[PDB]
Design a protein around this ligand. Sequence first.
Ligand SMILES: *[C@@H]1O[C@H](CO)[C@@H](O)[C@H](O)[C@H]1NC(C)=O
Lengths: 50, 49, 50, 50
Amino acid sequence: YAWNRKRISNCVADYSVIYNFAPFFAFKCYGVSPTKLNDLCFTNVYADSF
Amino acid sequence: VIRGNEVSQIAPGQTGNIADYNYKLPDDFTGCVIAWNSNKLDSKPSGNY
Amino acid sequence: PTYGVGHQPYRVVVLSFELLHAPATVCGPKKSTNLVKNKCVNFNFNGLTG
Amino acid sequence: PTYGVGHQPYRVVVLSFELLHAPATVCGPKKSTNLVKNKCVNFNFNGLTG
Ligand SMILES: *[C@@H]1O[C@H](CO)[C@@H](O)[C@H](O)[C@H]1NC(C)=O
């Protein structure tokens, strides 16, 4: 109920280092693909944790 | 034998680390992929090198 | 062995099949039937029906 | 207990549902409403909307 949002802006995002931080199976993406997160690039990232 | 993170990379039309530099499948691939856990055999307390 | 479930070793076997016009060297367990001609039958010649 | 993850026992329950071709007996938790006629309404008769 009190989930935390982290605001990510003005940096270089490397998504291949996320796999070394947690032992998860699926990087379940919806609008995009997990293998194409480095070629295209975004505006703002928000990370919700619970 | 891979790490459990890169099981999704053994598929046609994939990029990453295994699919880019280690083991690449063709785009017109016809076949099957079988992957199973081997924690009992390939894991050691000192570290399997 | 103390790692998370996404860092465990995984044994992978990939079975790739040649689907070509070559004669079938290896294929599966079917019993063969005697050939009859000039009669409306259902044929199964090396896996393909008709 | 020493078998692998593919050779563990699994308990399976299959719920077989048969649809609205008979008078309904199994219903979800919903509250009924008084029936009003000769008016443009949004009805819900045994799970089908309109
Ligand atoms: C998280 O941070 C702590 C200390 O800051 C460190 O010991 C730990 O290894 C970090 N986690 C990962 C997955 O690297």
